[PDB]
Amino acid sequence: KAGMTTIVRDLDRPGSKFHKREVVEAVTVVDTPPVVVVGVVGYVETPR
Amino acid sequence: SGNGAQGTKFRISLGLPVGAIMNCADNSGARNLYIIAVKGSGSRLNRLPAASLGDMVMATVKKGKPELRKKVMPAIVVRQAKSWRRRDGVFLYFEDNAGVIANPKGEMKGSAITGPVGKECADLWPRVASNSGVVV
Amino acid sequence: MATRTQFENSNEIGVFSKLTNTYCLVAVGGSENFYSAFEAELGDAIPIVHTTIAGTRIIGRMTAGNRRGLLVPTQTTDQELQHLRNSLPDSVKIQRVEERLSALGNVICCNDYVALVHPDIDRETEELISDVLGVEVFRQTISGNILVGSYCSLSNQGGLVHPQTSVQDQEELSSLLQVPLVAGTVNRGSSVVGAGMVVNDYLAVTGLDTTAPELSVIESIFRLQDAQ
Amino acid sequence: MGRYSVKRYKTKRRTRDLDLIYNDLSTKESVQKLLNQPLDETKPGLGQHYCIHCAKYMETAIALKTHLKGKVHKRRVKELRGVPYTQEVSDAAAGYNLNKFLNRVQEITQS
Amino acid sequence: MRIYQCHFCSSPCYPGHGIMFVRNDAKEFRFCRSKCHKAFKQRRNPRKLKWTKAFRKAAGKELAVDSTLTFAQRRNVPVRYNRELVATTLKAMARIEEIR
Amino acid sequence: SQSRHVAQPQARDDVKRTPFIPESVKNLKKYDPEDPNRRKLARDIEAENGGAGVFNVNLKDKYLLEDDEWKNDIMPEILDGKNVYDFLDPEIAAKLQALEEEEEKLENEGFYN
Amino acid sequence: AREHFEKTVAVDSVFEQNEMIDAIAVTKGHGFEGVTHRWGTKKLPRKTHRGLRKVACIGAWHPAHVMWSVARAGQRGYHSRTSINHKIYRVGKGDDEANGATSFDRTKKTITPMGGFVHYGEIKNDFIMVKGCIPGNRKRIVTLRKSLYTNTSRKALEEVSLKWIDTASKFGKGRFQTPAEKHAFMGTLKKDL
Amino acid sequence: EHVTHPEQYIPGVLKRCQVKHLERTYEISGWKDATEFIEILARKQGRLLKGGEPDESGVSKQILN
């Protein structure tokens, strides 16, 4: 989680009161560099 | 929402609790209104019913024309001193919090409104938008 | 050719729509039923434009205009103003007015030829009405009612004023407008007639709850029925 | 933020702004309206004795005459001589509607 | 959306920033930040506060009358859309910022 | 009961005031909801695309341009902190070129020595 | 998986824009915090003996115990939470400059605010911008999950059309989107001649 | 004291009492109406609230007492 910032969004929500109207939204920016696979785990399905 | 309200109303910050004097924007002869109740308010235990722009209240005319006082008529808040949010993000407020006398079906007792009227209230009440010379 | 319609179950047609001779503005909201109820009576003959004015659905009371041009309040965003320009052909001037009485629909009651305005609108705005809309302007009240646009529905044929309009005030306003004036109601006894309906020379749309005598007087004074 | 500024400059206690007062002073009709005013049971002195610049009411002709000799009245008068600070001024200062600012200043200076 | 300018210090008030005050005259007062809003509520003159752009223009700290500063005005009468016109507008703005 | 009127305009000036009805209106077919071939209203497109609240109306496909290929193109709002709409102006090339002439004159006159 | 044992997986190979995702993270920690704000219990009247920021009566004559349900003071925050249905507003690309630019805003800027984020550096990498707030504070590992069900709200279907991203500074009342804009608004300083 | 709008009962007092006596109990004269009888009395007695307006309800309470 990097932080938050402000977004203007051109809202296309038919049936809404903000339909076809720009709306300012708060958003969260998550820094996501690529993750690299290093292993496998196999799960069996047991009565416990 | 209420009777005569056009469509839904979104959240805006509540400015006017019960017991709040608010100006009379219309020309019905009242000079200020005293909120005794708020339509639509939920039942939280110690929470005072509070009113905001575009909300219909029940108000007594406390000062003004004696033909209007000692009576409890519905009112519709048209201005507000508490800063609320507009979705095209801006927090705004008016210099005074004011309302207009309306019959419970939405019609204005007065024939005009003086001073600005918030667009959240003009949009919600067609008879307010139709009696307001200044919107936003 | 008076028609009954309700924008999302409201008889105030003139709040949610603007109608002139050569275009029609209808608010954005919910479905297309209001738009289509204008389109049935107009088709593609004149442009029917969905629009919002400052995001509100009250475009009829916010904007003022006739077949020659359209005025929009200073609160209308650049996107909405561009939308109105893109939608309407160049024969219709569009102007954003830097004027206090932003609800131009309430404040200006005009047809193609003459306009009535709030008695205290700015001189610059009077001049801009005279230039853009191409009308001669009069500061008047509809029997003491300053919001002339809401209390007077007007076309080139005739005009309808709010029922408490005095007889000599009807006469004086008819002289100014050069149309016959009558004082009646719309939407079953509403005195706010400008908000209660939209009208031009060949169409009038009123709220669904208009009484039949009220349509009779509307179609008389506004000369809707063909070959009257 | 403190105590005094929040006590004095609430939107409850907000007084008349300077450009509005400038426009009140602009024409002879508005000023002659503001001086010869209708009686008003709520306003001090029943609405007579108005100081146009300060936009506040005095209780009597003595309190108005004493008001016109005080540094508060001088401070308000000095604040109003030039060109009122409107949104024209805050717009042109960033390169925006600069032409209307300029010719507004010319109109104010010539009238 | 658009950038408004702070009624006090002429700074850009982007969407979601500052607050606005509306008088009984429908005159909106945008403010970039609570600093300018509070200085306005306190009736402080922005032309005597040195950190405002109004002071710097009035005193001559920055250039006021120029050809580059006339191009940005509030366009009341709109124009129809045109990709060539708007692309020339974007190129124009890139040129005007450099020259100014 | 003695206790229980259209005002006419005595002419003020000789200006021709006449009603306007455009030709495309007068040439129009009156609507008939009983045709198989009547005009397709907006509800009809709305009905076959999802319903009242689901039909996302494209406001763009009905406005009038010099080219339908830029019917759906996005007009930019912001660039480097400037309102594009407020710099937007017909004949912007004319003012820009006058600015360029004045500026290269300032250069050749020696303004940034 | 065998084919992937040292290859990376980019974030756009898992999520994409206009998708609702779940955010699973341990919330921000607040330490030992009392009932008045750990549970929202009303403050007792002013200058109540033994204090006013505490729950007043704890029990009846029976069950002769404090129940588990009575609100008591203790640790607030740092709890594990699963917050679901966060609409993805942008899946950014690290190499792509103008991360923070859109088709309405042509400024050619990345989503990194001026001065970077506060208590977190730049965004040099791929990023996920989700609508609204997320459990956990900044710097914190979060797990983003695909939605456990095919959501039937119309929000889960909408295409998101950003007009603008606020890249102004979060370290103050930031008024500029780029250092270039700040410089062009200020003018030249005394550091410059 | 608990009468919420005691300004309305004052025309009742003017009905019961006589003007000849009421001009004398309070040294005031020439009221056209009760609603202004209160205000002329209050200005006479200095029962003006902060801001120049008469303490109209309180003077009405005193008149009823």
Curated annotation (Swiss-Prot), chain C:
The keyword Protease does not apply. One of its GO terms (biological process) is ribosomal subunit export from nucleus. Pfam families: eIF-6. Keywords: Cytoplasm, Initiation factor, Nucleus, Phosphoprotein, Protein biosynthesis, Ribosome biogenesis. Phosphorylation at Ser-174 and Ser-175 promotes nuclear export. Its main location: cytoplasm. It is found in: Cytoplasm; Nucleus, Nucleolus. The modification Phosphoserine is found at S174, S175. Transmembrane segments: none annotated. GO terms for molecular function: ribosomal large subunit binding; translation initiation factor activity. One of its GO terms (cellular component) is cytoplasm. The keyword Glycoprotein does not apply. Belongs to the eIF-6 family. Present with 18600 molecules/cell in log phase SD medium. Monomer. Associates with the 60S ribosomal subunit. Binds to the 60S ribosomal subunit and prevents its association with the 40S ribosomal subunit to form the 80S initiation complex in the cytoplasm. Is also involved in ribosome biogenesis. Associates with pre-60S subunits in the nucleus and is involved in its nuclear export. Cytoplasmic release of TIF6 from 60S subunits and nuclear relocalization is promoted by the GTPase RIA1/EFL1 and by SDO1. Also required for pre-rRNA processing. This is Eukaryotic translation initiation factor 6. It comes from Saccharomyces cerevisiae (strain ATCC 204508 / S288c) (Baker's yeast).
From Swiss-Prot, chain D:
A zinc finger (C2H2-type) spans 49-73. One of its GO terms (molecular function) is nucleic acid binding. One of its GO terms (biological process) is ribosomal large subunit export from nucleus. GO terms for cellular component: cytoplasm; nucleus; preribosome, large subunit precursor. Keywords: Cytoplasm, Metal-binding, Nucleus, Ribosome biogenesis, Zinc, Zinc-finger. Associates with pre-60S ribosomal particles; released from the pre-60S particle very early in the cytoplasm. Present with 5630 molecules/cell in log phase SD medium. Belongs to the ZNF593/BUD20 C2H2-type zinc-finger protein family. This is Bud site selection protein 20.
From Swiss-Prot, chain E:
One of its GO terms (molecular function) is ATPase binding. Belongs to the eukaryotic ribosomal protein eL24 family. This is Ribosome biogenesis protein RLP24. One of its GO terms (cellular component) is nucleolus. It is found in: Cytoplasm; Nucleus. The keyword Cytoplasm applies. Involved in the biogenesis of the 60S ribosomal subunit. Ensures the docking of NOG1 to pre-60S ribosomal particles. Activates and recruits ATPase AFG2 to cytoplasmic pre-60S ribosomal particles. The chain holds residues 1 to 100 of 199 of the full protein. The lineage of its organism: Eukaryota, Fungi, Dikarya, Ascomycota, Saccharomycotina.
From Swiss-Prot, chain G:
The modification Phosphoserine is found at S103. Methylation at His-49 by HPM1 is required for proper 60S subunit assembly and promotes translational elongation fidelity. It comes from the Eukaryota. The modification Pros-methylhistidine is found at H49. Coiled coil: none annotated. Disruption phenotype: A mutant confers resistance to trichodermin, a trichotecene toxin produced by plant-pathogenic fungi. It is found in: Cytoplasm. Belongs to the universal ribosomal protein uL3 family. Component of the large ribosomal subunit (LSU). Mature yeast ribosomes consist of a small (40S) and a large (60S) subunit. The 40S small subunit contains 1 molecule of ribosomal RNA (18S rRNA) and 33 different proteins (encoded by 57 genes). The large 60S subunit contains 3 rRNA molecules (25S, 5.8S and 5S rRNA) and 46 different proteins (encoded by 81 genes). uL3 forms together with ES39L one of the contact sites for the signal recognition particle that targets ribosomes to the endoplasmic reticulum membrane. Present with 450 molecules/cell in log phase SD medium. This is Large ribosomal subunit protein uL3.
